[PDB]
């Protein structure tokens, strides 16, 4: 009942989450998702990104591995344990594995 | 000379001497008159005194052995603990740390110039130990048998139950002899013990 | 600072004794809670590549299932993505005791917010029924791995202060208190050897 999982994604990705069952208006009523296409510049992702980590109602948040690509910077920016940050796999963008946050964290085991 | 051991009088007198009670300074320093160490100190004396107790009272052994496990328990305890922040403490470590505190505090440690601590009797003293220490493996049970069975009892219940008989215990300290009569003391002590059976019963 | 401050003299060497044994004590216990965190993180961070090479392969299959969704009815996207009121899966915040230390986790929980009805575009109650069992299912799983992962990132921290507090109680404090114990012992030596040549002397003259 406390936090509440986000998406950053295409609309197939963000049609195939939400038809998950997650996605709720908040106070502001701002939805809990966001759609990225071509047509959507850099700093409007940026700045949502931001936005949804600073509305700490959220607390998982779903990126694929391309929209992370973009704001690289702001992503490995993150390090904290609560409000996780998730690399996904996409149909668009298959996962490559040398390319987490996670296991940078844990670079060396091998 | 220093509070040591190395002085050749100390040395001398420590091999004839058949009971020994040494003070330490930092407890002196914290003013917990009296300033004993409770752990070097020792007497060979328990065994010759145990025909002595068995004729009259039959019960004062059993007592002494159990506070003293929990003392010297709590003391191997006290740095262990202190190096893991103190976070970790099973339900068992938790009653005993909490418990030998009081113990510290309450009934070993005393100045004559109240009414109630000049002298302590030994019922008194008797009975002070018999109820701390009842009331110390009662909880152990009652955290035993759940922890075994389900729902793991935490000290937090048996308080939010019986807090009032907890602290009717904790008060056993002051019941003053030069006012209160011997059987007073004892029936009120008594009191208090079938009250913790059955304060501990209408918790289970 | 190389070595402890203290008189020399009997009481200080068994003072002293005492701290070198608390060190050691420290030492071993900490060792201990070292190798239970290093065995915790291996067991963790086993094959979490797997798990999510399975994330992958479910979420190929949902993908597909979307394709047919796509197919068989035309165009539903643009209204399931218009009407947003509520979630229907939330979190129950939650904690974990892997160790002496604690490490978030999370629950899937069901909120049981009402699927919207898809009945008027071509009546795709059945595909859209399957998409949805497909991402329920996804759903669930990766609050799985994220559970696995938010732990796996917490529990680095304290491995790291553990290991620096092991390294400092090896490297710094021990040799410090050897070197003041050498130095102990042999100062009273000295001080006993004094006094044995002033007892000689005085023997020496008293053979007059």
Redesign the interface.
């Given at each position: 009942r406390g936090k509440l999982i986000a998406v950053i994604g295409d609309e197939d990705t963000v049609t195939g989450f939400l038809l998950g069952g997650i996605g709720e208006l908040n106070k502001n009523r701002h939805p809990n998702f966001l759609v990225v296409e071509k047509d959507t510049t850099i700093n409007e992702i940026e700045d949502t990104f931001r936005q949804f980590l600073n509305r700490d109602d959220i607390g998982i948040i779903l990126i694929n591995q391309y929209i992370a690509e973009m704001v690289r910077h702001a992503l490995d920016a993150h390090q904290r344990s609560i409000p996780a940050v998730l690399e996904i796999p996409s149909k668009e963008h298959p996962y490559d594995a040398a390319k987490d946050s996670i296991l940078r964290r844990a670079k060396g085991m091998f | 000379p220093?509070?040591?051991?190395?002085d050749p009088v100390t040395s001398a007198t420590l091999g004839i001497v058949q009971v020994f009670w040494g003070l330490d300074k930092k407890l002196a320093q914290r003013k917990h008159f009296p300033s004993v160490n409770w752990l070097i100190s020792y007497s060979k004396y328990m065994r010759a005194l145990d025909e002595y107790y068995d004729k009259h009272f039959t019960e004062f052994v059993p007592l002494r052995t159990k506070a003293k496990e929990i003392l010297q328990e709590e003391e191997d305890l006290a740095?262990?603990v202190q190096?893991?922040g103190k976070?970790?403490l099973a339900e068992t470590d938790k009653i005993t740390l909490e418990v030998a505190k009081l113990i510290k505090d309450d009934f070993l440690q005393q100045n004559g110039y109240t009414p109630y601590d000049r002298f302590c009797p030994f019922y008194k003293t008797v009975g002070m130990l018999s109820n701390m220490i009842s009331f110390y493996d009662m909880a152990r049970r009652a955290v035993e048998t759940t922890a075994q069975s389900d729902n793991k009892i935490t000290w937090s219940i048996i308080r939010e139950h019986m807090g009032e008989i907890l602290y009717k215990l904790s008060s056993m300290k002051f019941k003053d002899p030069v006012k209160d009569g011997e059987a007073k003391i004892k029936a009120d002590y008594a009191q208090l013990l079938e009250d913790m059976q059955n304060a501990f019963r209408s918790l289970e | 600072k190389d070595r402890i401050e203290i008189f020399p003299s009997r009481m200080a060497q068994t003072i002293m004794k005492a701290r070198l044994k608390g060190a050691q004590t420290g030492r071993n216990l900490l060792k201990k809670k070292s190798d239970a965190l290093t065995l915790r993180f291996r067991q963790i961070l086993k094959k979490i590549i797997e798990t999510k090479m399975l994330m992958g392969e479910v979420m190929r299959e949902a993908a597909f299932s979307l394709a047919e969704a796509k197919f068989t009815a035309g165009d539903f996207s643009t209204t399931v993505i218009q009407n947003v009121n509520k979630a229907q899966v939330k979190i129950r915040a939650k904690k974990d005791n892997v160790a002496g230390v604690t490490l978030p986790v999370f629950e899937h929980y069901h909120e049981g917010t009402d699927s919207y009805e898809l009945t008027g575009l071509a009546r795709g109650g059945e595909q859209l029924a399957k998409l949805k069992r497909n991402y329920a299912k996804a759903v669930e799983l990766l609050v799985e791995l994220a559970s696995l992962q938010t732990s796996f990132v917490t529990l680095d921290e304290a491995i790291k202060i553990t290991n620096r507090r092991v390294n400092a109680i090896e490297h710094v404090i021990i040799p410090r208190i050897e070197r003041t114990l050498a130095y102990i012992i042999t100062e009273l030596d000295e001080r006993e050897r004094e006094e044995f040549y002033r007892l000689k002397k005085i023997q020496e003259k008293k053979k007059i």
């Amino acid at each position: 009942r406390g936090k509440l999982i986000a998406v950053i994604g295409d609309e197939d990705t963000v049609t195939g989450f939400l038809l998950g069952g997650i996605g709720e208006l908040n106070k502001n009523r701002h939805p809990n998702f966001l759609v990225v296409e071509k047509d959507t510049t850099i700093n409007e992702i940026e700045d949502t990104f931001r936005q949804f980590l600073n509305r700490d109602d959220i607390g998982i948040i779903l990126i694929n591995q391309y929209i992370a690509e973009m704001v690289r910077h702001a992503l490995d920016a993150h390090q904290r344990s609560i409000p996780a940050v998730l690399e996904i796999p996409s149909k668009e963008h298959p996962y490559d594995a040398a390319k987490d946050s996670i296991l940078r964290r844990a670079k060396g085991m091998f | 000379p220093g509070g040591d051991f190395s002085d050749p009088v100390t040395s001398a007198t420590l091999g004839i001497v058949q009971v020994f009670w040494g003070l330490d300074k930092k407890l002196a320093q914290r003013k917990h008159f009296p300033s004993v160490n409770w752990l070097i100190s020792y007497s060979k004396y328990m065994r010759a005194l145990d025909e002595y107790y068995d004729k009259h009272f039959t019960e004062f052994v059993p007592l002494r052995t159990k506070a003293k496990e929990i003392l010297q328990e709590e003391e191997d305890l006290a740095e262990i603990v202190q190096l893991v922040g103190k976070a970790s403490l099973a339900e068992t470590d938790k009653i005993t740390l909490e418990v030998a505190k009081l113990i510290k505090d309450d009934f070993l440690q005393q100045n004559g110039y109240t009414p109630y601590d000049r002298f302590c009797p030994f019922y008194k003293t008797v009975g002070m130990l018999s109820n701390m220490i009842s009331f110390y493996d009662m909880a152990r049970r009652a955290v035993e048998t759940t922890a075994q069975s389900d729902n793991k009892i935490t000290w937090s219940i048996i308080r939010e139950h019986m807090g009032e008989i907890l602290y009717k215990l904790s008060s056993m300290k002051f019941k003053d002899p030069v006012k209160d009569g011997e059987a007073k003391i004892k029936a009120d002590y008594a009191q208090l013990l079938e009250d913790m059976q059955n304060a501990f019963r209408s918790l289970e | 600072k190389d070595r402890i401050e203290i008189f020399p003299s009997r009481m200080a060497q068994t003072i002293m004794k005492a701290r070198l044994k608390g060190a050691q004590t420290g030492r071993n216990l900490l060792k201990k809670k070292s190798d239970a965190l290093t065995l915790r993180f291996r067991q963790i961070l086993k094959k979490i590549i797997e798990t999510k090479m399975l994330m992958g392969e479910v979420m190929r299959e949902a993908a597909f299932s979307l394709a047919e969704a796509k197919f068989t009815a035309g165009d539903f996207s643009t209204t399931v993505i218009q009407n947003v009121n509520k979630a229907q899966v939330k979190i129950r915040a939650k904690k974990d005791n892997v160790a002496g230390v604690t490490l978030p986790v999370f629950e899937h929980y069901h909120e049981g917010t009402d699927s919207y009805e898809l009945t008027g575009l071509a009546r795709g109650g059945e595909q859209l029924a399957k998409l949805k069992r497909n991402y329920a299912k996804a759903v669930e799983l990766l609050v799985e791995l994220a559970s696995l992962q938010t732990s796996f990132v917490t529990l680095d921290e304290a491995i790291k202060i553990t290991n620096r507090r092991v390294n400092a109680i090896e490297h710094v404090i021990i040799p410090r208190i050897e070197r003041t114990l050498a130095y102990i012992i042999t100062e009273l030596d000295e001080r006993e050897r004094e006094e044995f040549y002033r007892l000689k002397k005085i023997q020496e003259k008293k053979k007059i």
